[PDB]
Amino acid sequence: DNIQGITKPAIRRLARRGGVKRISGLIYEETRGVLKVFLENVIRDAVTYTEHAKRKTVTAMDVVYALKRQGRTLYGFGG
Amino acid sequence: RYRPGTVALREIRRYQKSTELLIRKLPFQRLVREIAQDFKTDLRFQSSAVMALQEASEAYLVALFEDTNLCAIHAKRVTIMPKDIQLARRIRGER
Amino acid sequence: IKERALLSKVKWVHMIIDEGHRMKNAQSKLSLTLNTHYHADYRLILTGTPLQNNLPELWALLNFVLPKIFNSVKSFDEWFNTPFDKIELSEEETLLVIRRLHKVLRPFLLRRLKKDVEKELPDKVEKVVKCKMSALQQIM
Amino acid sequence: TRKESYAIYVYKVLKQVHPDTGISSKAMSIMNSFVNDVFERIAGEASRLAHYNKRSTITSREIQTAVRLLLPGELAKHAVSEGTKAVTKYTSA
Amino acid sequence: INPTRETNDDIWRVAGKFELLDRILPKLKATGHRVLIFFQMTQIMDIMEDFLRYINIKYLRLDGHTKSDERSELLRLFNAPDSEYLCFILSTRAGGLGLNLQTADTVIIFDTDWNPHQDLQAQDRAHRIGQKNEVRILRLITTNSVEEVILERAYKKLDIDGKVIQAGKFDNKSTSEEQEALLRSLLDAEEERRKKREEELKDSEINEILARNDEEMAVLTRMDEDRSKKEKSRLREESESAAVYNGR
DNA sequence: AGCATCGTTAATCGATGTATATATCTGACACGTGCCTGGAGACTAGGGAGTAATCCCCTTGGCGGTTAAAACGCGGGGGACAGCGCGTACGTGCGTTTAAGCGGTGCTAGAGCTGTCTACGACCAATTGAGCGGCCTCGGCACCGGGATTCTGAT
DNA sequence: ATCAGAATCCCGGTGCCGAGGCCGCTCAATTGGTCGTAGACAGCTCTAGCACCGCTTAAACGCACGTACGCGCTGTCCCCCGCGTTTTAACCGCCAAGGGGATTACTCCCTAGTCTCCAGGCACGTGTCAGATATATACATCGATTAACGATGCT
């Protein structure tokens, strides 16, 4: 499938950036779950803004308005 | 051979030094499409939109691992555990 | 493309590129990176058949093949109207424009057949067939 | 279609602060989204202050109070100073 | 269809391409003449490997993702005339330019030329200088489908460049009269297919393609005492259930 | 008291990654240009905001009597914390696959803009009844007093 | 596993101040008409998004192995809890002064609106250099083993 396409080395690198030194073996499944949650939360909003405009394309502005909608503001992609 | 924990620190400095994106494009894009299938079928995504979800997702996970690291270090342990993650998400009010 | 950082430093004279249909568009990276290749005086292109039926890229072709038309890029798109009153339209469009194309393009392309060189070609050696479906599949 | 932006203005201010330093296009986009963000914040707070006090007109006072609400500390003090100086010079001449 | 996904009798009974394919194969191996076939990529070539392994007719395989080592090695494996394998799989895009063969004979194309230059490109890999055999080409198409419409558009395009490349055929030494010769005769061909714009299940019709002489017509009668004589039929729950799972 | 040996901290050397100096090569950045639509100037009406005057009610302040609550102390038991040891789980490196990345082809669906044209909402005059401030009941709930019940702790 | 006993639930009784219904009295909600205009709908263009394969190679995956650390266990000690006693400041009830919120009447001048005119800024090009990359060379740092110095013991 797909969510498994996020790789143990990937999450490992994301933890190396955050400052984590050593990682337990069970962090990976939980990280995939959290990522799936957050992605569902943002994508449902972006698809909502998309359906309201009566468009079949999900643009960058829809995602920006979904992130700003949930309280996390994003710059550089428009706004 | 290096003593265990040195390569990890060198990786910390390396990845904290650059701006590189840490998740490969195509798997993340297929994941976004799969998650979007459950809402409305036959949707079109612009490249900048997928890039936006990658920026927000990666930054969110980086912050989550920062706070999780704070929890693990507060427990007098250098190894983060799932209870540290779900603890941070419990204190932030996300659950 | 990867070794263009090396093999393009040295000077070249006569290059041989094969399957011009693979070349196709001039917007493709291969084309515009063959200008990164510096220069080779003599050139050539080998192909088993010319470009796509639509033929907007006759431009691209004769630009990479020849000094001729590289000055004016946007010219021939309306002069391509021959392909796209069959007697009169074939006459003006097909006969006029295509007679012009032959008049200009004679001393470049070279084509022959197998029957010309031999006649040992056994037949036209081309047929087709038809088939049926299955209802369990046909419902799809 | 002409889509306006703040790009040239951020460019001018950049040439005032650092005449020798240029800016990438992506950083210019970040600056644009920043100016639009802060603009919508101050305008929104001004709308709230105008609605709570029952007034239909946004003046420099509501924008001032909005700046004092949004910008912490020295950003608010120096911001109100620069803005008040700008309105001063504006209406004076 | 099946949970077990083992090699099954019904793998080749689901469509007609495998039925007529199982019809021609005994005559293929019978006549001793080989065949080239072109395919789409990924699962199509895999399933064809599963069929040719099912009835056990040995085959080479070639495609885009293979290395150059066994590319040239397989090319050399073809060149041995003692070959006991007749057919084999080759990719239209990857391998259409991939070989030069004087010794081949028969060609088959499933994809029906999304570009005609690819089908005529890989099409001439049979007939070659010094061909001691007689070539026959087959386009396998099913009725009541979009693919024969793709063939329609295909020779529509063959006319489109038929005013270009079939105009470019008489140009070599810059002749004079032959151009209008191909305009009147070829124009009778495009008019013939203006008529074209707007079965074979029995043994004889299929015998006609690969016969090429009465000698082959006679030696193929040995395959008529089983395929026809034979001392089930082609064809619900999979249709309703299929409609349920495919409704996503 | 001196010398020798042992213990352990005192010492240098190598291999890897990391910084520096020069060359080179390109794709994004800086600047000039034609044009056009939005910004500035000028003029007018009117309604919202400023401003004076008055009214009153809710804030502040004080005082005195009650008393629940906070401060202060004092035993002591249980939990914070350090130490120690075990076992196993994760870092680390290497050989082997494998899809990611880049390119290139073919198609076309829907983003994006325009041109009408019309139903629909802003706006004003007329009208009136739903909701609200002031004003009355009266009863559900706070408070209390007693008894029965339950949960905690030392035998 | 059990009674003594302190805290809590349960039940009956009592008094009260806020919930709930009524009644004028508006003034904003409803109706009836206009009038301009935002967007609904049809049409046209053409760009970027979709699928797929060819081909290379940096990354992922599986595995062998070592040892760093998580966790369980134990001992110690210290410090925060449970309770008694004593003090004090919260609380409540009342009374009084007054000033700042709330409203109304009057007026004026700042901005919405429209018309007119033009240049500040924008898409489109053009050239061109900051730095990203590559090669060469040297420094920082970790990991290893040494090999010296000091102390203790023996003669």
UniProtKB/Swiss-Prot annotation, chain A:
| Residues with PTM N6-lactoyllysine | K8, K54, K68
Q: Which domain of life is it from?
A: Eukaryota
| Covalent link Glycyl lysine isopeptide (Lys-Gly) (interchain with G-Cter in ubiquitin), residues | K68
Q: What is its main location?
A: nucleus
Carrying N6-acetyllysine, the residues are: K8, K36, K56, K68
- Which residues in this protein are found as Phosphotyrosine? Y28, Y65
- Which processes are annotated in GO (biological process)? nucleosome assembly
Spell out which residues are annotated as carrying N6-butyryllysine.
Answer: K8, K21, K54, K56, K68
Q: Which family does it belong to?
A: Belongs to the histone H4 family.
**Protein function:** Core component of nucleosome. Nucleosomes wrap and compact DNA into chromatin, limiting DNA accessibility to the cellular machineries which require DNA as a template. Histones thereby play a central role in transcription regulation, DNA repair, DNA replication and chromosomal stability. DNA accessibility is regulated via a complex set of post-translational modifications of histones, also called histone code, and nucleosome remodeling.
A single GO molecular function, which one? DNA binding
> Which residues get modified to N6-(2-hydroxyisobutyryl)lysine?
K8, K21, K36, K54, K56, K68
Q: Give the record's PTM text.
A: Demethylation is performed by JMJD6.
Name-wise, this protein is Histone H4
Species the sequence originates in: Xenopus laevis (African clawed frog)
List of residues that carry N6-propionyllysine? K8, K21, K54, K56, K68
Annotated compartments: Nucleus; Chromosome
| Cross-linked sites for Glycyl lysine isopeptide (Lys-Gly) (interchain with G-Cter in UFM1) | K8
Q: Which positions bear Phosphoserine?
A: S24
Q: Could you give the subunit structure recorded for this chain?
A: The nucleosome is a histone octamer containing two molecules each of H2A, H2B, H3 and H4 assembled in one H3-H4 heterotetramer and two H2A-H2B heterodimers. The octamer wraps approximately 147 bp of DNA.
Keywords of this entry: Acetylation, Chromosome, Citrullination, DNA-binding, Hydroxylation, Isopeptide bond, Methylation, Nucleosome core, Nucleus, Phosphoprotein, Ubl conjugation
Positions carrying N6-glutaryllysine: K8, K36, K54, K56, K68
Q: Please tell me where this chain falls within the complete protein, as first and last residue plus total length.
A: 25 to 103 of 103
Sites bearing N6-succinyllysine, chain numbering: K8, K54, K68
GO annotations of cellular component type? nucleosome; nucleus
Curated annotation (Swiss-Prot), chain B:
What is annotated about its quaternary structure and interactions? Answer: The nucleosome is a histone octamer containing two molecules each of H2A, H2B, H3 and H4 assembled in one H3-H4 heterotetramer and two H2A-H2B heterodimers. The octamer wraps approximately 147 bp of DNA.
Reported function: Core component of nucleosome. Nucleosomes wrap and compact DNA into chromatin, limiting DNA accessibility to the cellular machineries which require DNA as a template. Histones thereby play a central role in transcription regulation, DNA repair, DNA replication and chromosomal stability. DNA accessibility is regulated via a complex set of post-translational modifications of histones, also called histone code, and nucleosome remodeling.
State the family it belongs to. Answer: Belongs to the histone H3 family.
> What positions are modified (N6-lactoyllysine)?
K17, K40
Give the positions of lipid attachment, kind S-palmitoyl cysteine.
Answer: C71
Q: Which residues carry this modification: Phosphoserine?
A: S18, S47
Any one GO molecular function term: protein heterodimerization activity
Q: What is its main location?
A: nucleus
Residues where N6-methyllysine is found: K17, K25, K40, K83
Q: What are the protein's UniProt keywords?
A: Acetylation, ADP-ribosylation, Chromosome, Citrullination, DNA-binding, Hydroxylation, Lipoprotein, Methylation, Nucleosome core, Nucleus, Palmitate, Phosphoprotein, Ubl conjugation
- Entry keyword Phosphoprotein: yes
Residues that bear N6-succinyllysine: K17, K40, K83
What are the N6-(2-hydroxyisobutyryl)lysine sites (modified residues) in this protein? K17, K25, K40, K83
Q: Which residues carry this modification: N6,N6,N6-trimethyllysine?
A: K17, K40
User: This protein is called what?
Assistant: Histone H3.2
Chain positions found as Phosphotyrosine: Y2
Provide the protein's localization: Nucleus; Chromosome
Membrane-crossing ranges are none
Q: Name one GO cellular component term.
A: nucleosome
Curated annotation (Swiss-Prot), chain D:
Q: How is it modified after translation?
A: Monoubiquitination of Lys-89 by BRE1 gives a specific tag for epigenetic transcriptional activation and is also prerequisite for histone H3 'Lys-4' and 'Lys-79' methylation. GlcNAcylation at Ser-81 promotes monoubiquitination of Lys-89. It fluctuates in response to extracellular glucose, and associates with transcribed genes.
**Sugar-bearing residue positions:** S81
Where it mainly occurs, coarsely classed, is nucleus
Subunit info here reads:
The nucleosome is a histone octamer containing two molecules each of H2A, H2B, H3 and H4 assembled in one H3-H4 heterotetramer and two H2A-H2B heterodimers. The octamer wraps approximately 147 bp of DNA.
Please state what the protein is called.
Answer: Histone H2B 1.1
* Cross-link Glycyl lysine isopeptide (Lys-Gly) (interchain with G-Cter in ubiquitin): where in chain: K89
The family this protein is said to belong to: Belongs to the histone H2B family.
Functionally, this protein is described as follows: Core component of nucleosome. Nucleosomes wrap and compact DNA into chromatin, limiting DNA accessibility to the cellular machineries which require DNA as a template. Histones thereby play a central role in transcription regulation, DNA repair, DNA replication and chromosomal stability. DNA accessibility is regulated via a complex set of post-translational modifications of histones, also called histone code, and nucleosome remodeling.
Give from-to of the shown chain within the full protein: 33 to 125 of 126
**One GO CC term on file:** nucleosome
Location in or out of the cell = Nucleus; Chromosome
Could you tell me which species this protein originates from?
Answer: Xenopus laevis (African clawed frog)
Keyword annotations for this protein? Acetylation, Chromosome, DNA-binding, Glycoprotein, Isopeptide bond, Nucleosome core, Nucleus, Phosphoprotein, Ubl conjugation
UniProtKB/Swiss-Prot annotation, chain E:
Q: Which domain of life is it from?
A: Eukaryota
What subcellular compartments does it reside in?
Nucleus
In-chain residues carrying the UniProt-annotated modification Phosphoserine? S239
Q: Where does the record place a coiled coil? A: none
Q: Where is the Helicase C-terminal domain?
A: 20-183
What else the UniProt entry mentions is: Present with 217 molecules/cell in log phase SD medium.
Describe the subunit structure: Component of the SWI/SNF global transcription activator complex. The 1.14 MDa SWI/SNF complex is composed of 11 different subunits: one copy each of SWI1, SNF2/SWI2, SNF5, SNF12/SWP73, ARP7/SWP61, ARP9/SWP59; two copies each of SWI3, SNF6, SNF11, SWP82; and three copies of TAF14/SWP29.
Q: What does this protein do?
A: Involved in transcriptional activation. Catalytic component of the SWI/SNF complex, an ATP-dependent chromatin-remodeling complex, which is required for the positive and negative regulation of gene expression of a large number of genes. It changes chromatin structure by altering DNA-histone contacts within a nucleosome, leading eventually to a change in nucleosome position, thus facilitating or repressing binding of gene-specific transcription factors.
Name this polypeptide is given: Transcription regulatory protein SNF2
> Which residues of the complete protein does this chain represent?
1072 to 1349 of 1703
